[PDB]
Design an enzyme around this catalytic site. Sequence first.
Site, PDB file in Angstrom:
ATOM      1  N   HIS A 114       0.795  -1.217   0.000  1.00  0.00           N
ATOM      2  CA  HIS A 114       0.000   0.000   0.000  1.00  0.00           C
ATOM      3  C   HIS A 114       0.830   1.271   0.000  1.00  0.00           C
ATOM      4  O   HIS A 114       0.278   2.347  -0.251  1.00  0.00           O
ATOM      5  CB  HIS A 114      -0.933   0.034   1.214  1.00  0.00           C
ATOM      6  CG  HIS A 114      -2.178  -0.769   1.041  1.00  0.00           C
ATOM      7  ND1 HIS A 114      -3.159  -0.432   0.136  1.00  0.00           N
ATOM      8  CD2 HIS A 114      -2.610  -1.890   1.664  1.00  0.00           C
ATOM      9  CE1 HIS A 114      -4.139  -1.315   0.204  1.00  0.00           C
ATOM     10  NE2 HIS A 114      -3.832  -2.208   1.127  1.00  0.00           N
TER      11      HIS A 114
HETATM   12 ZN   LIG Z   1      -5.609  -6.450   2.111  1.00  0.00          ZN
END
Ligand SMILES: [Zn+2]
Lengths: 411, 613, 656, 40
Positions: free
Chosen positions: B130
Amino acid sequence: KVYYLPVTLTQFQKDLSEILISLHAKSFKASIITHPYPTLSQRQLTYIFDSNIRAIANHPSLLVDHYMPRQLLRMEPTESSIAGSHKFQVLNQLINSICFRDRPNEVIKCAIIAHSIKELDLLEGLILGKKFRTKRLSGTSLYNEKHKFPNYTGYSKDDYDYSVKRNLKKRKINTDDWLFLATTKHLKHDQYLLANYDIDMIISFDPMLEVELPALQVLRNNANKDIPIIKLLVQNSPDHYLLDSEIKNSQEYEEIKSSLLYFLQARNAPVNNCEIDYIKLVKCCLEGKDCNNILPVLDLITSSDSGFWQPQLTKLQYSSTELPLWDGPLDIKTYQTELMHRAVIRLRDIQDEYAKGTVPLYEKRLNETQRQNQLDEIKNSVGLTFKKKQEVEKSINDSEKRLKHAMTEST
Amino acid sequence: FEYIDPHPEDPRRIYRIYKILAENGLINDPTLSGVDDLGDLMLKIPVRAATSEEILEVHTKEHLEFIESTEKMSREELLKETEKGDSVYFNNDSYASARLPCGGAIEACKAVVEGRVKNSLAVVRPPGHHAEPQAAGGFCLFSNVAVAAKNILKNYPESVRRIMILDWDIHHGNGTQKSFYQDDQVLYVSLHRFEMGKYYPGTIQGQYDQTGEGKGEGFNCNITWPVGGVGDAEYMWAFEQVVMPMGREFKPDLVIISSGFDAADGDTIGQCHVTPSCYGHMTHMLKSLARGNLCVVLEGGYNLDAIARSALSVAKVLIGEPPDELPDPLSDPKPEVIEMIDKVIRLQSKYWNCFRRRHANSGCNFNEPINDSIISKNFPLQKAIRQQQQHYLSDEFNFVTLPLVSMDLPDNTVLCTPNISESNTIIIVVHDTSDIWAKRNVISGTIDLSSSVIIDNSLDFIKWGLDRKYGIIDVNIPLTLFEPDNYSGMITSQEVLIYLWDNYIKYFPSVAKIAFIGIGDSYSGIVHLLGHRDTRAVTKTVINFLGDKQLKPLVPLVDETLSEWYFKNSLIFSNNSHQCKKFGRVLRCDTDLNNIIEERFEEATDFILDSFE
Amino acid sequence: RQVIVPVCMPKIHYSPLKTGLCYDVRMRYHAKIFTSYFEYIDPHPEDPRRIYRIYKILAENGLINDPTLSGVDDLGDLMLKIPVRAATSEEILEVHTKEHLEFIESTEKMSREELLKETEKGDSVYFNNDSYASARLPCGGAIEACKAVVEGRVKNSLAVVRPPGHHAEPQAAGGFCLFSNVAVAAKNILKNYPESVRRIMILDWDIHHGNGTQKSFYQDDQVLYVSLHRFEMGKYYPGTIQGQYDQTGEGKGEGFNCNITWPVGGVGDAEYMWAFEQVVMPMGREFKPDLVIISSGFDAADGDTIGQCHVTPSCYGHMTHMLKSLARGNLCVVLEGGYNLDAIARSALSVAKVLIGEPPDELPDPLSDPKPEVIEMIDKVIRLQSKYWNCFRRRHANSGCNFNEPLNDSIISKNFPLQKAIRQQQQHYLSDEFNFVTLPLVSMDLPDNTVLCTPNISESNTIIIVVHDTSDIWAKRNVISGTIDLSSSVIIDNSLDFIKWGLDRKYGIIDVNIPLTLFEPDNYSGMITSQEVLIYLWDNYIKYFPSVAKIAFIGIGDSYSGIVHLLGHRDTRAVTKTVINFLGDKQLKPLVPLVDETLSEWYFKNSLIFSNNSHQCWKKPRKKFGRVLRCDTDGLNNIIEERFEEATDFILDSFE
Amino acid sequence: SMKSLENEVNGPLTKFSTESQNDFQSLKARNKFLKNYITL
Ligand SMILES: [Zn+2]
Ligand SMILES: [Zn+2]
C-alpha cells in the site's frame, strides 16, 4: 581534465596481500637490509612482488596463473564477481549510474581502457549482458554482437516492390550509449585507434595512462570540449607512490624499491576516504565543470626501522594461526606449492572460523521464540481477564439495584 | 485494554503458517525456530536486511530520513505520528524490522532467478503493497515487491527484462501501481473491490479505467468487483478470460504473486467465500504461465485457520501436487461481474491484441474517442436516430423540443407539440429506443445493413394522438450512451420525470386528463413519479408495455391509496413466456416485443378512450 | 529445548511416486504384406517403426536408464516399468461381439492368398499371421496401465503402445484397428472398480474422428467423450455422419458426447488453446470426473503431410498441463496416430516432460489470431451445448433453448429508413466545417445529398473522387441475455481521412454515396445505380470543366463497379491517372474494354486493389481484374488504417 | 568473506590438485538467457 577516485581494498584483498607479504618478506628485507633449483634474481623476486600485488589490486581472483576457459566466465552472476574487490563494486556502481541517468535524444559515448588483456576479458565478462552498444577493439572477443557504428511481386512481369520502403517502418533501432574496449598495448603500438570514434569520456581502468599519448592528443584536439579522464585510484598502492610523484601540477629499480617501501610502511595505514556521490560527479564531467565532488587529499604521509616486516593477518574469532615468513631460497614449483597449500591452510582457518560461529545465534533464536510465545500467551490471558471483568460489571449493577429495593422495603 | 480486539496485523500469523507447514510433514524442524536443515522437500533460504542503496531506488530520501528518525522517538511522538498517518502505527522497535521484508523478497527472488531453486515462498510481515514512494500508509512501511523488482531489473539486465506482478488481495495495490504507472517493462494486474470510497482506500486510482500513462501505457489492469460476496467461479472466470491470455501475450520473464488472503472465506473485512482449492487452481495456471519463475510473498490475512488452510494448499501446489477438486462447480456467477469484465475487455482490446477478433471487437477502433467532431472517425448512433426523427416530425407536425435548463443533456431529448400549455388534454409517452432484428457478424462485431429489420414502434401512438388533437409529450431515455460509463438510465429518468412534474406540469393553465404510457424498462421512472408524488387529481390511468422485463414494484411514500389506485388504473402487458397485488394488474399477453404492441395497441387505446370517456 | 511439533512423514500422495511406463518389443511384428511399389513412396499409414523411436528418444534425455534399448526393469529413479500382459478373451468380449473374435481367430491361421483377400476385403485394414497375439497385447497392457493408476502405485501412466484402437467397432474392424484400446480398458475399470471410479472423461486429439469408442459409449453416462477432428463431410476420412458436430449422444447418453470439427485443414496451436480454454475446462469441471484418459494422436503436428496442421509440441505441453489440472492427478495416456517420426518424437518428449511434472515451455508465437471458421464453429457448438449443459448458459447468454423462429419479414413496409439518417448526419457535419456543395442531378430518382462537391470546383485543377456506400455500424450485444443494444452503437466513417488529406493539400474533392438495396444478397441493382450515376456525372460535368488535370478515384467496399464501368464504356485515360480500391470481401470487378484494348493494359498499370486475407481466392488471379493485393488482416477499417500511407504515397507518386 | 574465498578457490586454482550440473549456481535458469543476447 584528469580526476581521481578514492579506492580501498577489501578484507579478502588485504588478507591475500598479507599472504604475499608472508611469501616475499625475507627476500624483501634482504634486498632492503624439472629445472636447476637456482631460479631467479632478487630483481625478478621484486618483479614477482609488485606484479602480483597489482594483480591483487584488480580483482583478487587474478592471482591464478592459468587462463580462463572462456566457458564459465560468461556464465557467472555480477554480484559474486564484484564480491572479490571493491574496485569492481565502484566500477559497476559507476556504470549503473551512468546507464540509468535522465536523457532529449542523447547518444553520448564512452570508452574504457585496460592495461593488459585478461583484465579486459574480465571487463567484457562483466559488461556482457548490460544494455550498451559495445565494440571491442582487441582480439578474441566474447560473443561479439554486430552493432556497427555510423561512419511486392505478386504476379509475373510487373514491378511494384514496396518492401524496400516498407521495412524502414517496421525495423526498430537501438538507442544505447556507445562504448568501446581496448588496452594500452594497442594504444602504444599504433595510434588513431580511438580518433575515429567521437568519444566523450575515458573512464579508464589503468591509472598510469601518460595522458599526452599521440592518438589521445589528437582526440583532445579534434573535439569541441575537453574530454574528462577518470582513473581508478587505490589509496595506498605501489602505483600511488609514482602517482603522487606525478600528482604535482636501473632508476626504475630505485622507483620500485621506494614505492614498495611506501606501500609496506603504509600497509596498515588506517585512514580512508569516503562519501563519494556518482550522479553529481558524472553530471560534472559530462556537463563540463570542475568536479569538486572528488576528494582532493590524494596523498598520505610516510629511516628503515623494524616492525612492519613480520606479516600479521586480520582478526579471527578463535582461529589463531601464524605466518611462517618463508625464510629461505625459492623454486617456482616450491613457490606455487607453498602458495597453494598456504592458501589451503588459510581456507581451513576460515572454514573452521565460519563453521564454529553457528550455535550462539541458534540459542539466541530459541530464547527469542520462547520469549515471544510467553508474550502473546500473556496477551491472550489479559484479554480473557478483561472480558471476565467486563461481564461481571452487569451483575454488580443489578446487585446494587436489588440492594436499593431492599433498602426501600427496610425503611 | 483492547486485547480482546487486537489489530489483526500481529506477529503470530507467520507462526501459524510455520506451525501448519511443520504440522503436515513438510518441515522437519520441531522447535519452530529458523534452522537450515529443513529436510528433503524444501530449502531454508537465509535472510539479510535491506541496505540503503537498494531501498533508495524506488523510495525517496525524505521518507528514509523520516523512518530513520522515528526509530528513537519518545512515546508521545510515536503516538502523534501514529494518529497523523492514514491507518498506520509506529514503534520504537520498527526500523530494523522494516528492512527485513525487502531483503527477504530480494533473496527469494535472487535464489529463483539464479536458478538455485525452482519457486519461492516468503512468509513476511509487515505488508508492503500500500505504501506510496514518498509516504507510508495503511500498515505498510516499505513497498517490498517494487523494491525487489527494481533491484532485479538493475542487478540482472541480462536474463530478466519483463516482470508480471499480480495482486489478489481484496485491497487495491495503490503504491505499487503508482510506482510503475510510467514504466513499460513491468506489468501490474490487480483484483479488488472498488466501490469509490466505501472500501479501503477508495480513491480514483482503484478504478479500472486507469490503464497507464505515457510509454508505460497498456501495462496496468484492474478488475473491480462491484459488490462483495464473490465465490469461486468469479475468480475462475476472471482468470480464464482475462489473466491467462494477457499473460501468455506478455511473455513474462518473472512472475510476482503478491498474495493477500484477506478475501478468503470466513473473514469479516472482505466477506467472500473463497475456498483454498480455487487458490490452488489459480496458482496452477499461474505456474503454467511462464516457465516456472514464481516468487510468492504475503500481504494480507486476518483470520488464522483460513489463512492456514489456504497457505497449506498453495504450498501443496507449489511443491508439486495437483490442486484438489472444487466444492461446487454449478456456481453461475453474478451478472454485473460479467458486464464489468466485458467493460475491461473493451479497453484491453484498445491496448492489447488478444481480444480483437475473438470477442467481436475488430470492427471499430476504440483508440479514438466516440466523438461528434471531425478529428475522430467514430460517431455515435443515438444522434442520427434523434436527428432523423426530429426532421421527420419537424416536416410533418412541426413539433417543438422541450429544453432542459440546468441539466447536462442533449438538446432534442424530449419533444412536444407547440402550445402544449394550451393543449387541454395531454398524453405523455415515455418510450425507449427500439430493438433491431438483424444478424451480427460474430467476428467483426458488425451487422449487415441488408438484413437490418428496424421498426419505430413508439411513433404509432402519436398517430393515434394526433387524431384526438391531444397534446403530445414524448420522452426518450438513452441506455447509458456507452460513452460516460457512470450513467444510469434509471436515476436520470427519475430526474427528468420529477423535473417535468415540478417544473412544467404544475404551471400549465390548461392541464387536464393526463395519461401515461411507458414502454420497456423505462416505466420504472414512471414508478418513481408514481410512488413519490400525488398526480392522481389530473392524471387518469397508466399503461406499461413491459414484455419480458422484470416486474416493477410500486411502493407509495405519501399515502396508501396510491398503490390501490395504481392497481386500479394500470394496464401492464407482459411476456407470455414470463409466467410471473402491489404491482398493478400485470397482464400476460398471448403471442410473444412489437408483436404484443400490435396485439394490444387496440385494447390499450380503447381502455384509454374509455377512462377518458 | 521443548518440543512443540513432532517429526513424522510427509502426508502427501503425489510425487514420491514415479511415472508408470508400458513398453515391450513384442508389439513390432504385425506388418503389412507387399503388394505394389507405391508403398515405397507412401507414408505407410501404420508402421511398427514408431514406438522404438519414442522409447529411444526417451532414453536420450536421461528419463530412461537403459543403454541398450530393451525391455528391462531398472528404468531409473523417475519412471517405473509396468509389466505387460495380453488380455483375455473375456475382456475383449466385454465390448466386442463373439463373431468378431471368431473372425480374428480365423485370420490367425489363414493361408497367404486368404490373407490377401481379407486385406483387400475389409475397410482400410490389413492382416498377417502374427496378428492375433499382437492384437491381444495392447489393450490388456493398457488395462495394466490404469490399474497402476487407480491403485495409486504411480503418479501417472504413459503406455506407448501400437496398433491403435480408436477406430474399431464392436461389430467389425476398420481403419487399421483390430480391437478397441481405450473403450475396453474403460469398461474393465468400470466393471472391476465400481467403488473408486465413477466418471471417466476421454479426450481424442487424433485428427481422425474416433468413431469406434464413440459408438461403444454412445448411450452411457459414466463416459464423457470429447473428440477433435476435421469433418469435410464426404471427402476426408472417415467422413460419416457420426462425426458431425450435432451428434450429442442418445438416450441416457444425451449430453455426454462432444465433437469438435475443423472446417478447413490448416489449423495451428491457438485454435487448440482457444478451444480448450473456452470449452473443455468448464465442461470437464462440470462433469466432475474421477479419471481422465487421453487417446493421443500426433498426426496433427507440424511437419506432417497427412493432416497438414501446425501444432508445435509446446502446444501439446499446455494441453497436458491443463488436463493434469483437470482431474485430481490420476491420468493415463495411450497413442493412436502418427506419420512423421520426428514430430511424434518431439511431441512424446514434451508430453513426457510435463507428465513427470515439469512446467510446459512457452508458445513459439502467441500472436496468431486464429481462423474465423473455428470461431463460428465454436459458436455453433456452444449453442447445442448450452442446451444440454448448464455452465455455458448465461455466460454466453444463450438463455435456455432460445432457438428463434422469428426474424419474420411481414411488417417490412413499416421500417426506419436508417440510411438517409446516416447520410444526413454525415452531410450535416461535412457541410458544417467544409461547406460542401450538394450538387444536383436531374432526370434520376435519387436523394438530394447523393453527391457532395467542393466549393469552387470549376477552378480546381486536381480533383479526386471518393465513392462509398453508407459506412459501417458497430453494435454491442448486452451481455446478460440475448439481444443487441442499438443506442450503444457507433458509425465508423471510413472516407474522412482521405477527404481531409485531400482537403489540406488544396485538391478538388467530390464525394458520392450509393445506398444498398434491402433484402438482396448482392447489391446488383445498386451496382446498376452506381453505373448510371457515374456515367451521368462524367458526361454532364467533368467533360465540360476548363481547368482539369490528373484525376484519381478512391474506391471503397462495393460500388467499385461504377468506376470499372466508367473506365470501360468511355475513354478518359488522358486526364485521369490512377485508381485505387479497398474491396474488402465482395466479389471482384472484371473490366470490359470497349473503346480500346490497350486500355486493359493501362488499367493494369496504374491501379491497386486491396482484399481480405480470408477471401474466397488464394486457395494467380487473371489480369482482367488488375493487380489485386492480399493484405494480412480482416475488415475494411483495419486495411484502410494499415495501408493508408502506402495508398496515399501511391497517389502522390502518380502526380508530379 | 568465506563465500568469496570459497568461490575463489573453486574457480581457477593454483598449481596442484590437493584440495581443489544441478544445482546450476552458474546462472543457468535458461529463459531468455542466450536469447537476451542479440544473436545476430
Ligand atoms: Zn488487504
Ligand atoms: Zn489417426
